[PDB]
Amino acid sequence: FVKKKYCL
Amino acid sequence: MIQRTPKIQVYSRHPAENGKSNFLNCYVSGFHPSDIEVDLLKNGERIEKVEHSDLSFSKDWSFYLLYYTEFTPTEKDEYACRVNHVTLSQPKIVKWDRDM
Amino acid sequence: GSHSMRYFDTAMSRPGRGEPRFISVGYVDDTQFVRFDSDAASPREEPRAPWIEQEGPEYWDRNTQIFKTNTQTDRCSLRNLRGYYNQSEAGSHTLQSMYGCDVGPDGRLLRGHNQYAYDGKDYIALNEDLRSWTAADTAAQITQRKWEAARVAEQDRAYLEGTCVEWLRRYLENGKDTLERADPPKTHVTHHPISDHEATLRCWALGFYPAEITLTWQRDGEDQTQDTELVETRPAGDRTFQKWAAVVVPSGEEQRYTCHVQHEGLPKPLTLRWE
């Protein structure tokens, strides 16, 4: 199940 | 910008038997950046409709891809993999040798 | 055995050739079960493993939505990273991500992972505590400060201890006939003369899963690390892997060499000789 990512 | 040159291996999915259908593999690994061109050759000519795996990488961040096609090895025919990458001044050809 | 779930993401800018490509590939151990590629023309036709289809269309829809938003997030990251390194808009740059969880045979969490590399160099990683960051340089310190301010590690921790472990356990159950089956290597030794004086002994391992394997040569029971040529473990295309290890041996001394094989699918480690 994919993870929500955060902008670097 | 750091660059890593590809490692190349050419080999068959199953042990080779002249006259029996098989798959020919070219596995390119260890490279950076990701752009790369790979051809499989039969008697020096490009094989059409070669497929490849989806771009992924090892835990050291170096990329890998498998290129592959169906093939029936014989005594006569010669097979190879030709690779180009920014780290290479000319395309690198690796011949298929059934002992490797 | 123990198992891992890992997503490997690559975002690559390509000035003058559209927006950065984003591709995310999900694995259970060495089995790919999902791909999302922003360059795919038919997202509906994008490969998923069979034990994923049984989860249904709402599961697929929720994953697809997050992948689409992740494409935009990684493009935001590439724009910011270009600025953090004072880089021109002309060149191509690469952001890679690995995230996921490792569990033991009882399904309990061993550790979580969420880390990044830029242009092939490590950039920032979530530490094993799932609470603090390690930043590689003053650019990654900017990311670390922003993520601290926004409490990003707490969101990552909740995914890694919760969603990641829970869905890995579900995948392992639904795919138990394959994901929980270790296939042992099929092994043999070949002999290739190089001169009247020496020959290569090559120890082969074929058809094994998962990819982790140990293959070594001993001479008189002593390991031959420095003199062994060991190729990278390579996919056969049928889910299984291949590897070989070779040593150059003096003619007549072949029976002093033993090849040693360890793998999860073997009831006991193998010792093999030529013939």
Residue numbers in the entry:
A (entry chain C): 1 to 8
B (entry chain B): 0 to 99
C (entry chain A): 1 to 275
What does the paper say about this structure?
Antigen presentation by major histocompatibility class I (MHC I) molecules is central to adaptive immunity. MHC I molecules bind peptides and present them at the cell surface to specific receptors on CD8+ T cells. MHC I molecules bind peptides in a groove that is lined with discrete pockets (A to F). The stability of MHC class I molecules is highly dependent on interaction with a bound peptide ligand.
The 8mer FAKKKYCL and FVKKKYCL control peptides were also synthesized. Comparisons of FA and FV 20mers with their corresponding FA (pink) and FV (green) 8mers show that 8mer peptides adopt nearly identical bound conformations and that P1 is the most divergent position in both 20/8mer pairs, with shifts in Cα-atom of 3.13-Å for FAs and 1.42-Å for FVs. MHC I peptide ligands are usually 8 to 10 amino acids long and bind with their N-terminal amino group pointing down in the A pocket, as seen in the FA and FV 8mer structures. Interestingly, the structure of FA 8mer shows that the P1 side-chain phenyl ring occupies a canonical position and forms hydrophobic interactions with Tyr59, and that residues Gln54 to Tyr59 are visible. Similar observations were made relative to the FV 8mer structure. In contrast, the canonical structures of FA and FV 8mers showed very similar networks of interactions and exhibited identical Tm values, 71.1 °C for FA 8mer and 71.4 °C for FV 8mer. Finally, it is worth noting that there are two water molecules in pocket A of the 8mer structures. These water molecules form a network of hydrogen bonds with MHC I residues in pocket A, including Tyr59, that anchor the peptide N-terminal amino group. Results show that FA and FV 8mers have symmetric distributions centered around 90°, indicating that the two aromatic rings are essentially perpendicular to each other.
